[PDB]
Amino acid sequence: NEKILIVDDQSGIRILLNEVFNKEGYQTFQAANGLQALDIVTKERPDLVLLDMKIPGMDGIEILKRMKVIDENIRVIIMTAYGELDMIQESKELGALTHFAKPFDIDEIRDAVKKYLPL
Amino acid sequence: NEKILIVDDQSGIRILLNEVFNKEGYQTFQAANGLQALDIVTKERPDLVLLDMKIPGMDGIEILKRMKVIDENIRVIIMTAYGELDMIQESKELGALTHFAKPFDIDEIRDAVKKYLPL
Ligand SMILES: [Ca+2]
Ligand SMILES: [Ca+2]
């Protein structure tokens, strides 16, 4: 029943993550930019978002703020590129659950969402 | 002491894999195409190669044949895109150790190389 939206500009990684959580029984969706994402959040209203903050043109902080407006029950976990202080701080402020840096420990990501979005 | 060369056209995934094996104590190298790879094999003579068979322009079977010519002690594990019969067959013939399809189980890949290239 749980839905997870994976936002990432890179097919390879995005597709790998998707599988990790499909394999877990989660209804997963995928987005490559903040526009698509915003769209899916609107349409599907996922429980959690795995949001890549490094997307060209993309202001991840802004999309994070919008998701919430759209759906205030959505929880987000941001993916940093080797964690950046100010983004991590604004996100905590925005309500993000945690942050994971890439390259990631898939197992740790896994463990993390299961804990945050128990099936 | 063990060296592993990761050949993959996609930075994201390639970089993630690299980390998995760096984290394991392996001296890792990276390539985005068969040319670079061939070069590194020549230069570094790695113990194992994780070879993405789906690289544009790239005949993975041919690069596999060349690696071996260059370095007959090199072992290869091919990454298929949802495993293809004839490629898997020629590779077995060429001496590949096994094949993994993407999206992969990183843990299983991990377990696999450790077993094939024990540290
Ligand atoms: Ca990105
Ligand atoms: Ca590829």
CATH number at residue A2: 3.40.50.2300
- Count of domains for chain A: 1
Nearest partner of A12 among B88, B73, B11, judged by Cα: B11
Looking at chain A, list the stretches that DSSP marks H as alpha helix, in order from N- to C-terminal side. Answer: 11-22, 34-44, 60-70, 85-94, 106-116
Q: Which of A83, B46, A12 is nearest to B38 (CA)?
A: B46
Contact state of A104 with B18 under an 8 Å Cβ cutoff: no
Q: Which residues lie closer than 8 Å to B57 by C-beta, 6 or more apart?
A: B33
β-strand pairing of B3-7 with A48-52: unpaired
The whole-angstrom separation of Cα B106 and Cα A106 is 8
In the chain, the amino acid numbered A79 is M
| Annotated binding-site members of A for Mg(2+) | 8-9, 52, 54
User: From which experimental method does this structure derive?
Assistant: X-ray
- Helices (DSSP H) in chain B: which residue ranges? 11-22, 34-44, 60-70, 85-94, 106-116
Instruction: For residue B39, say whether it is annotated as part of any ligand binding site.
Output: no
- Residue B11 Cα, gap to closest chain A Cα (Å): 8
Nearest residue in A to B20, CA atom = A105
Nearest C-alpha of chain A: how many angstroms from B59? 20
3-state secondary structure of B52: strand
- Put simply, the answer to whether A16 touches B102 (Cβ < 8 Å) is yes
DSSP-derived letter for residue A32 is S
B75-80 and B27-31 strand pairing: unpaired
Owner of token pair 């096994």: B98
Residue B88 CA to residue B91 CA, distance in Å, equals 5
Residue B11 in tokens:
């930075």
Residue B32 neighbours by CB distance under 10 Å = 16
Written as six digits, the tokens of A107 are 């197992």
Listed residue (A78, A107, B48, B23) closest to A87, CA to CA = A78
- Based on its alpha-carbon atoms, the radius of gyration of chain A, rounded to whole angstroms, reads 13
Total CB pairs under 8 A between chain A and B: 40
Instruction: Report how far residue B11's alpha carbon sits from residue B19's, in angstroms, rounded to the nearest whole number.
Output: 12
Tell me how far apart the alpha carbons of residues A99 and A85 are, in angstroms, rounded to a whole number: 11
Per the structure, the complete domain to which residue A32 belongs is given by 1-119
* Distance separating alpha carbons of residues A55 and A32, to the nearest angstrom: 8
